[PDB]
A = this chain, B = another copy of it.
Amino acid sequence: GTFKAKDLIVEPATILKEKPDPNNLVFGTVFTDHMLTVEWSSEFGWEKPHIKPLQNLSLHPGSSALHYAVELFEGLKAFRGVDNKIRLFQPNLNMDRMYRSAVRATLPVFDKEELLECIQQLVKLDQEWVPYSTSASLYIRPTFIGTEPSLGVKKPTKALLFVLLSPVGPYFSSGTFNPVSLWANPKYVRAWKGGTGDCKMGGNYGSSLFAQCEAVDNGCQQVLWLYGEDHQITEVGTMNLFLYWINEDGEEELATPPLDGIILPGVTRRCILDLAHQWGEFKVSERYLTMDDLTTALEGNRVREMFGSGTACVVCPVSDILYKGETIHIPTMENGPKLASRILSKLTDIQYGREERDWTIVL
């Protein structure tokens, strides 16, 4: 049925690496000393979980992860609080999303509580990698791949679940948010109804690289994902999309696309919606937003802020959109950004223990 944290076999590294300067860190480039691995087969089920030194995987070249993208991942973070206790943030939501992704991948199910405990054991061993800074954190990358050594397209009879750790630094520079410009070309689609875009399966990402390179060489930084005949705004890069504006009815509104199958249900997205409801200061709407809705609002000076949301950076303000040849300015930064900054402050307060709330777990 499942591996068990009580069976953990731990092989410590005998040489330890020096830690990076948290302020000089690129996301996903530096790894800690150890990793978690757990093997599965249909014949014997789950093997015992191992923590061992970071090393290459040994994979049969026919492994289905390499041929048919039988893989999924997660992302969550460990935070060194102002009281020096290490916290995780809503990790159970990630365990939930990962399990669902595994079912949809036909990867073997596991006990979410045991995985969580194994990750905590790994973070505990490598806890010195959790930076001494309230603008840096330790990124946790659970990954799950088919290692079926046969070329049939089929449910894997072998798999590997592993966890990597990677320190992540601040996304601010010169004291402020560093806004992004987006490339909006409806020729590309990220996800479609009946597809797998609401799951964190590897398959959804390989096809985005071409569009990202096109964004870059037009001097944008990220892609604005459009969908349907009406050019709905869905996501920004690998982040969920929020729009703070005066809506059609002249009402102040925080809007985000609904979970209708083509939106990844981000943890950050869920938390922001919970905050905004609790505050009760403006309307909170999961609703469709089109490029027309947006360009109209802009002409009528009704847009206050646009930002992405995701684990790594929390929130990411948008300053410009390149669409049908014209550079459209978004006034996010000229408006503070008031709401983006409030959300970043509130989320980080919770993550670093400045505010105690049950969204976090110590250890």
Residues on A facing B (Cβ under 8 Å): 26-29, 31, 35, 54-63, 65-71, 73, 103-106, 139, 141, 143, 145, 150-155, 162, 164, 166, 186-189, 192-196, 201-210, 212-213, 237-238
* Cα–Cα, bound, A203→B212 (Å): 16
**In-complex Cβ contact of A67 among B31, B202, B210 (8 A):** B202
CB distance from A237 to the nearest CB of B (A): 8
**In-complex Cβ contact of A71 among B67, B103, B105 (8 A):** B67
CB–CB A193/B202 < 8 A: no
A213 surroundings in chain B (CB, below 8 A): 106, 155
CB–CB A209/B155 < 8 A: yes
CB–CB B143/A67 < 8 A: yes
Which residue of chain B lies nearest to A145 when distances are taken between CB atoms in the complex?
B66
**In-complex Cβ contact of A66 among B35, B62, B71, B189 (8 A):** B71
CB distance from A38 to the nearest CB of B (A): 13
Known: A65-B65, A145-B66. A60 touches B71 (CB 8 A): no
CB distance from A189 to the nearest CB of B (A): 3
CB–CB B238/A153 < 8 A: yes
CB–CB A203/B194 < 8 A: no
Which residue of chain B lies nearest to A237 when distances are taken between CB atoms in the complex?
B153
CB–CB B152/A28 < 8 A: yes
CB–CB A62/B189 < 8 A: no
CB distance from A73 to the nearest CB of B (A): 5
A188 surroundings in chain B (CB, below 8 A): 194
Most B-side CB within 10 Å, residue of A71, A207, A208? A207
* Cα–Cα, bound, A207→B207 (Å): 13
A205 surroundings in chain B (CB, below 8 A): 67-69, 153, 203
Known: A62-B164, A66-B71, A66-B202. 17 other contacts (CB 8 A): A26-B150, A35-B61, A57-B63, A57-B66, A59-B59, A65-B66, A67-B71, A68-B206, A69-B69, A69-B202, A69-B204, A70-B209, A105-B209, A106-B210, A153-B208, A153-B212, A186-B194
Which residue of chain B lies nearest to A28 when distances are taken between CB atoms in the complex?
B151
Known: A59-B59, A213-B106. A207 touches B196 (CB 8 A): yes
CB–CB A206/B212 < 8 A: no
CB–CB B206/A150 < 8 A: no
Which residue of chain B lies nearest to A59 when distances are taken between CB atoms in the complex?
B57
A105 surroundings in chain B (CB, below 8 A): 206, 209-210
**In-complex Cβ contact of A56 among B61, B152, B207 (8 A):** B61
CB distance from A209 to the nearest CB of B (A): 4
Which residue of chain B lies nearest to A207 when distances are taken between CB atoms in the complex?
B196
CB–CB A202/B195 < 8 A: no
CB distance from A124 to the nearest CB of B (A): 20
Known: A164-B61, A203-B204, A213-B106. A27 touches B67 (CB 8 A): no
14 A-B pairs whose Cβ atoms sit less than 8 Å apart in the complex? A26-B150, A28-B62, A56-B59, A66-B66, A66-B202, A68-B205, A68-B209, A70-B206, A154-B212, A188-B194, A195-B207, A196-B206, A201-B207, A203-B206
